[PDB]
Design a protein around this ligand. Structure first.
Ligand SMILES: OC[C@H]1O[C@@](CO)(O[C@H]2O[C@H](CO)[C@@H](O)[C@H](O)[C@H]2O)[C@@H](O)[C@@H]1O
Ligand SMILES: OC[C@H]1O[C@@](CO)(O[C@H]2O[C@H](CO)[C@@H](O)[C@H](O)[C@H]2O)[C@@H](O)[C@@H]1O
Ligand SMILES: OC[C@H]1O[C@@](CO)(O[C@H]2O[C@H](CO)[C@@H](O)[C@H](O)[C@H]2O)[C@@H](O)[C@@H]1O
Ligand SMILES: OC[C@H]1O[C@@](CO)(O[C@H]2O[C@H](CO)[C@@H](O)[C@H](O)[C@H]2O)[C@@H](O)[C@@H]1O
Ligand SMILES: OC[C@H]1O[C@@](CO)(O[C@H]2O[C@H](CO)[C@@H](O)[C@H](O)[C@H]2O)[C@@H](O)[C@@H]1O
Ligand SMILES: OC[C@H]1O[C@@](CO)(O[C@H]2O[C@H](CO)[C@@H](O)[C@H](O)[C@H]2O)[C@@H](O)[C@@H]1O
Ligand SMILES: O=N[O-]
Ligand SMILES: O=N[O-]
Ligand SMILES: O=N[O-]
Ligand SMILES: O=N[O-]
Ligand SMILES: O=N[O-]
Ligand SMILES: O=N[O-]
Ligand SMILES: O=N[O-]
Ligand SMILES: O=N[O-]
Ligand SMILES: O=N[O-]
Ligand SMILES: [Cu+2]
Ligand SMILES: [Cu+2]
Ligand SMILES: [Cu+2]
Ligand SMILES: [Cu+2]
Ligand SMILES: [Cu+2]
Ligand SMILES: [Cu+2]
Lengths: 341, 341, 341
């Protein structure tokens, strides 16, 4: 027992929600204990009911958000149940050495492994499966990726000596999927990930996804699963993309404070319209809602947002501010005396 | 008449030129009145005379640049003449609430609407049509996008307490187009936007444009329509892309001061070779010309620049500086006594 | 002889290595003399032995890294031997005027030219061939690109008044290739660049590379050609991409200090997981190795990294730090008393 710190077990929750944590803490460093269970399963990924052979951490795309503080140790039990068919591992971009932990965590079905890494770098970071060779992109684009957030012990700041505090936090994992089609253009179904592999690899090689989804499927964060907020709330939106670039935009809003490279040692940019998540990274945006109503959160390739699945909704309760925006005259017939050339 | 400020009507001009404005102002806030008229029309988009069914604000791709100051109110009359076939609206990324104004501006052919938004955020911002669902990307990649610039009341600064002033300003709108081809590879023509839609949507789904153009067509800003400048002039180049990333580069020059995320609350970067406009945003670069001659302004995917239409020219008058660059020896035969292995 | 400075001949070396230079210097400005010889040749670009008709500076993809100091003059002899079939030239993104030198350097086979440019802008910059029109992207994606580094005379700094010094420097040139296929999907071979052109241009038009390689071929910087370092060494990694965006990531490491836009007048970002090289630019990352072992350096589009060739290896000698990372429990059977739902 060389490392003599207090241990704290964390129960992970399904995205887009985030397990209970403190922003600022005066506790010393702890060993923060997490468990991730690999689950291979068929999942529905679009509104027409297209299925595909997914591979996940904890049964979700993305994997759950892990939250710790700078100087904590993160002790992860990775479990690969014997119902799975492939070996898996885990690479933390937040970690130092052994390919992020991938070189120490390769487990066959029926095995588990325990990795400990010190959280020396602040920010939001991708984690993902990386077995080796062509298996790396295949496991990642099959759904085996998530994120970890390492907060400064004093919480967030604006990089100019002022504390920032969020009222709410959501984790938006964006997934590029490569679903094979038959000669007529219909999506193909398979009985196992292994059976899907050869056809999937051919789609992956052309670098054009068939679907781009938040929280594992088209429409996942729309309708009844819209994200909730209130006028005046500072909301932190963590956005990850393990394989492909994304350009997040809150329609009707802004990024008040944006860490687009996702690392809290760097001051955020202010008042962004659209920001950029480089493939293989996580970023974070803080926004204080000023108006009630529906907001679409998109990647601002609008073809991807509207036609390949990459739209989420916020439903924001409160009172409308007519000073910021108003309809001066409702839609009306163009006046007869108008010239419009 | 709740809002009791002076009103000022602005006459918009066609890109790449920009309507008359002040950089720094000591006037108080005003209500700045703009009119945009939707025009659906067939347009020529390449040097071989390829046509396509465009949808525009004010008859141009991009729509005109609107320039206001922080704290102004922007009152926009959007007009959809009864010669048009579809409903349209407008979303300002500069605006707060109601999906940027899109939720308050949906008008059928024969209708107009008046929206007012407060310019609380400084920078250059995209505006675009966003009717709903798959219509959003279709109207945007059909040409319905432009930009607005919200200047600080004191004009631009270098983020270190020094004022920056431009001698000239150009607005470069970049458009990704998706033109259907027949089985032989020839571009297809249609008699209406509606007739083009199904085939166009199939091209859009593969996320590879057929054309990438500045100011609405290949070669628009070359030859006689080259952009003019003089040695010693500080030129502001505003660049927008509503749907797809761009990487602007001034061949033979630099970006002296670049806001690549386009927001003047953030200090510019200095001395860039190539900068990055994320899809769904506008950015701005200031350069002081040091040498006369021809400059190509490109997106530095050179396939897009040279083969899909995304090249503009600057013609710069003045005297050559042999200290910065000189031809020491003109092309000559390789000397007989040379070894070149 | 208007310019009366000392002259210094530099001997270039093949990437990923870099010719001998000083970081900080108290010498005054010099005329730094470089020679580049164009070589068209068939080259092997993947591990299955696929060939293609390359065009190179000095026989390598990328061209060699040139290193000078701010205020130096760079005098380049470009040679196009009569064994070559096409005209060539050179454009320096570091240079001011005449399209970066391209307008002053166009040479037929059997000719040479001497260009001098003043190094007024600090950073890493792309250089590339740019003959004119569609020849520009074709020569660049055929391999005619490299980089130049213009150091501040005081060497690198962290943008907050602290000197940064590297123990080692590597230049990673990333190349997107467009190799034609026959109807069965096999790569086509040609006897000359001219014969390859028409088929290659058709692949280039669809903006999807067939290969993405470091140092000219899949696996070039793996196995026996892994990059060497030691625990505790600060290593500068210069990364260029003349045509297409890249997202570099050091697997198991970080970017301690990253200039992603590549320009030393701007403070670096700290502690990045993944950074972004915009097509048509060079960037630089400093990392101090903390753990021994194998590191993969990738573009974090993992399809490109694992399946299209864009992976390099570092082999790092030293002692493992179990405080940063440890395997707490080796792979073992899942305990019988475990519940994993
Ligand atoms: O996309 C090609 C072609 O295939 C069809 C079916 O023949 O539709 C498929 O692809 C669509 C777009 O991805 C999906 O909407 C649908 O689930 C799938 O069957 C054609 O409609 C289409 O032109
Ligand atoms: O800098 C972050 C900041 O943006 C704020 C200003 O305090 O608001 C932006 O939009 C508001 C709209 O009323 C204005 O107060 C302000 O002028 C503008 O930059 C906050 O919401 C937040 O702290
Ligand atoms: O691009 C496919 C194929 O189509 C042809 C005509 O059969 O040319 C078309 O496409 C070209 C590239 O976009 C355009 O230059 C031209 O306007 C269009 O007819 C072939 O030339 C080409 O291989
Ligand atoms: O920082 C902006 C600045 O770049 C300037 C320097 O004042 O010039 C750059 O190129 C010039 C070439 O002669 C040099 O003065 C300077 O050393 C270099 O950084 C201006 O054009 C502008 O203010
Ligand atoms: O990629 C299409 C198709 O072509 C085949 C040969 O028929 O393989 C070629 O393409 C592969 C992927 O690029 C290469 O691995 C190989 O060198 C090349 O022959 C098929 O295997 C493949 O489905
Ligand atoms: O800011 C650059 C800096 O990162 C350093 C800190 O000095 O290390 C990072 O990782 C180390 C792991 O032990 C820690 O010292 C530090 O807390 C963390 O930010 C150096 O390697 C380098 O100077
Ligand atoms: O130690 N107090 O939180
Ligand atoms: O399955 N994803 O939330
Ligand atoms: O572990 N890979 O299939
Ligand atoms: O009020 N003077 O510009
Ligand atoms: O039609 N565009 O300038
Ligand atoms: O309003 N859309 O076609
Ligand atoms: O002049 N001394 O290096
Ligand atoms: O051929 N390239 O190193
Ligand atoms: O010089 N171009 O083939
Ligand atoms: Cu896996
Ligand atoms: Cu990774
Ligand atoms: Cu419209
Ligand atoms: Cu938008
Ligand atoms: Cu060439
Ligand atoms: Cu260039």
């Amino acid at each position: 027992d060389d490392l003599k710190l207090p241990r704290q077990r964390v129960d992970l929750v399904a995205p887009p929600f985030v397990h209970v944590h403190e922003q600022a803490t005066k506790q010393g460093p702890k060993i923060m204990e997490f468990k991730l269970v690999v689950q291979e399963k068929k999942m529905v990924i679009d509104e027409k009911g297209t299925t595909f052979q997914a591979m996940t951490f904890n049964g979700s795309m993305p994997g759950p958000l892990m939250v710790v503080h700078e100087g904590d140790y993160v002790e992860v039990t990775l479990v690969n149940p014997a119902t799975n068919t492939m070996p898996h591992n885990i690479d933390f971009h937040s970690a130092t050495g052994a390919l992020g932990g991938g070189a120490l965590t390769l487990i066959n079905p029926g095995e588990q492994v325990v990795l400990r890494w010190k959280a020396t770098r602040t920010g939001v970071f991708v984690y993902h499966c990386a077995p080796g060779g062509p298996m790396i992109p295949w496991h990642v684009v099959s759904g085996m990726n998530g994120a970890v957030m390492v907060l400064p012990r004093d919480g967030l700041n604006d990089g100019h000596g002022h504390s920032l505090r969020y009222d709410r936090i959501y984790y938006i994992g964006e997934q590029d999927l490569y679903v094979p089609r038959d000669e007529k253009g219909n999506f193909k179904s398979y009985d196992s990930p292994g059976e899907a592999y050869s056809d999937t690899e051919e789609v992956m090689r052309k670098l054009t996804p068939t679907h781009v989804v938040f929280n594992g499927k088209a429409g996942a964060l729309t309708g009844k699963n819209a994200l909730n907020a209130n006028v005046g709330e500072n909301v932190l939106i963590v956005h990850s993309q393990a394989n492909r670039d994304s350009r997040p935009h809150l329609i009707g809003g802004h990024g008040d404070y944006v860490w687009e490279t996702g690392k809290f040692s760097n001051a955020p940019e202010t008042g962004l319209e659209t920001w950029f998540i480089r493939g293989g990274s996580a970023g974070a945006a803080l926004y204080k809602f000023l108006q009630p109503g529906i907001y679409a959160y998109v990647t601002h390739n609008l073809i991807e947002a509207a036609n390949l699945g990459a739209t989420a909704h916020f439903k924001v309760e409160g009172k409308w501010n007519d000073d910021l925006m108003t309809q001066v005259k409702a839609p009306a017939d163009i006046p007869t005396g108008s010239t419009n050339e």
